[PDB]
Amino acid sequence: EVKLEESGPELVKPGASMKMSCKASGYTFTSYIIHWLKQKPGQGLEWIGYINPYNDGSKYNEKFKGKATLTSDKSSSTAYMELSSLASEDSAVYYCTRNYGSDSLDYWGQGTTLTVSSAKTTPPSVYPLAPGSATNSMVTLGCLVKGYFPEPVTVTWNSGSLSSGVHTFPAVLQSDLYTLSSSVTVPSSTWPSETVTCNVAHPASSTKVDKKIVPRD
Amino acid sequence: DIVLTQTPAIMSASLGERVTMTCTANSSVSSNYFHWYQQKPGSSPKLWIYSTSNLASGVPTRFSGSGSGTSYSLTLSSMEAEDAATYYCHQYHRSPPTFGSGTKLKMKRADAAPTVSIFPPSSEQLTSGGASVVCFLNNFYPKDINVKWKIDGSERQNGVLNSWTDQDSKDSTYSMSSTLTLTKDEYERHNSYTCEATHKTSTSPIVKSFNRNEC
Ligand SMILES: *[C@@H]1O[C@H](CO[C@@H]2O[C@@H](C)[C@@H](O)[C@@H](O)[C@@H]2O)[C@@H](O)[C@H](O)[C@H]1NC(C)=O
Ligand SMILES: [K+]
């Protein structure tokens, strides 16, 4: 199986640089060009450049030829992109992707979320959302994920959720801290009987949270 | 950097309907180096069509592509639920390769009223000196909705964060979260917190309230 595995999310300060990686496996690394692209939230894709790991040659979007440097390490089958002298508008998801026949992009990395900001990396506070003491055949519960920076966070539930019963809302930024929420709708015979837990990961701070939804006493 | 303009930018289709979207290039591009991608929220793009009209591995046969010169199209013979996504065109006739702004294809479905749920601040949050009241408005259609917060009968507008999911993979409805955040001191000066939803499915708001004296 062909896989492109990108490095994790990072926060970088304005004026500094970032280097991210794209680890290739399952095929002959040196036989295929790898492209690097940028995608801002709610925008299309912008091409930065490519690396040819066969001859170490890289080609650049003229816009990026100063800022970007693409390299590869044959020893580890890994391509890298360095972006220098960063500013807030370099904040985006960056993809590596393999050049296939007629220069279509067939396999893609999962994306690396880069945030450029003066703010501090902060882990999330996670709070249980349980109904107020005031039930239907279904009950909605949730968790509120507050006070973290940067993106992303992931939320996974342990629950008896029904069809279309799990909703995790895109985060909203306010004052250098994100708020995210997630709801789960479960049959009322399953809770508080069976344990329901909201599992939050924040890779940028190397933290997780396993929050149990306890009924209000 | 050859500009590619995709139209329409946004469109909706009911199940079973034919859908065509176009991509117009500002310069001629060889059909051998024109490709399409599909992207769903939170996921990487997927190669969808290569060299104008060849389907990528796993792409349903209801899709096709055509074009030459500056005018290209992706056609879907029968709209299905899993086809709601953003579609991007791509030219590699010249360096740098460029991509379209996207056509976001949505699924039309029957109107659905929001199911509203309200939650008080957790005891855990109350130790932080903040207090959030959360309102979920789940599984509604269409997307158009207005949410109002009332604190002891008066509208509250400050400290409200709203977020919407994109169409649910299974039932194609939207959901929304509304979080009112106050200081703990401000939170404890009021009794009742009400989230009120106005949606086309009801002439009356769909509302839920929490009061501090009941809990
Ligand atoms: C690219 O094209 C955009 C749309 O213009 C229309 O389509 C192009 C291909 C021409 O046929 C033009 O006469 C049409 O009105 C423009 O809005 C845009 O400015 C163009 N961009 C550049 C950089 O030239
Ligand atoms: K726990």
Numbering used by the authors:
A (entry chain H): 1 to 52, 52A, 53 to 82, 82A, 82B, 82C, 83 to 100, 100A, ...
B (entry chain L): 1 to 27, 27A, 28 to 214
Give verbatim lines from the article.
The N14C3 model with 5% lower unit-cell volume is of higher overall quality, with a better map appearance and fewer disordered regions than N14A3, despite comparable data-quality statistics and resolution. We therefore elected to deposit both a conservative model and an ‘enthusiastic’ model of one of the N14 Fab structures and suggest some practical points for maintaining a parsimonious model without unduly restricting experienced model building. To explore the ability of a reasonably experienced crystallographer and the restraint necessary to produce a reasonably ‘clean’ PDB validation report, we refined and deposited the N14C3 model optimistically (meaning that we extended our interpretative freedom to lower density levels while at the same time not introducing obviously conjectural or wrong model features) and with more parsimonious restraints, attempting to obtain a validation report with a reasonably achievable minimum of outliers. The arguable compromise we selected is to show the actual density and a possible but not unique model in Figs. 2 and 3, demonstrating that something has to be there, but depositing in the conservative model only the positional and conformationally certain Asn-linked NAG and omitting the second NAG also in the enthusiastic model. Premature solvent placement can also obscure the shape of difference density.
The monoclonal antibody N14 is used as a detection antibody in ELISA kits for the human glycoprotein afamin, a member of the albumin family, which has recently gained interest in the capture and stabilization of Wnt signalling proteins, and for its role in metabolic syndrome and papillary thyroid carcinoma. Each Fab chain consists of a variable domain (VL and VH, respectively) harbouring the six complementarity-determining regions (CDRs) and a constant domain (CL and CH1, respectively); the domain boundaries in Kabat notation are defined as VL ≤ L107 < CL and VH ≤ H113 < CH1.
